[PDB]
């Protein structure tokens, strides 16, 4: 697992860890999954935790998350709100804030720049995939 990967997984971990206590509870999984338009059942949430909870304590810590970590089009659809096939800074800034993240336009712009391959100022589907593959 590369250094950047552990750091990306750390970032993801932080997005679920609402209280910032080093643990992801079922409540946190549900809350986040509902903010993105999902509707998990208590049983499905219990099973997610169960399927990767090594020490059987009922919550996932960063190390367990790591093991777990160690579909694109659907994720693309969450970012591309207006459905035009392109993610713009404003759409990106929306998702980020939705994830509780508070960031500067400059930062949202740098993020767009990181994924933008052809340099049109937005992220299309192929560029979104490449960034994930």
């Amino acid at each position: 697992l590369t250094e950047e990967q552990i750091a990306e997984f750390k970032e993801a971990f932080s997005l679920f860890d609402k209280d910032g206590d080093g643990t992801i509870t079922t409540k946190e999984l549900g809350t986040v999954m509902r903010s993105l338009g999902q509707n998990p059942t208590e049983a499905e949430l219990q099973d997610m935790i169960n399927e990767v909870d090594a020490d059987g304590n009922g919550t996932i810590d960063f190390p367990e998350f790591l093991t777990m970590m160690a579909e694109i089009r659907e994720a693309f659809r969450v970012f591309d709100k207006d459905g035009n096939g392109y993610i713009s800074a404003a759409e990106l800034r929306h998702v980020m804030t939705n994830l509780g993240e508070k960031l500067t336009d400059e930062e949202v712009d740098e993020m767009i720049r990181e994924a933008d391959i052809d340099g049109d100022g937005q992220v299309n589907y192929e560029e979104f995939v490449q960034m994930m593959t």
């Binding site: 990306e8 997005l15 679920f16 993105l36 659907e74 994720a75 960031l103 930062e107």
Partner: peptide, 18 residues
């Protein structure tokens, strides 16, 4: 601020949430 890290982490999160 690491642009690629913050973006991929949020994409991973939505990818898992989905």
């Amino acid at each position: 601020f690491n642009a690629r890290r913050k973006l991929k982490g949020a994409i991973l999160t939505t990818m898992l949430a989905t």
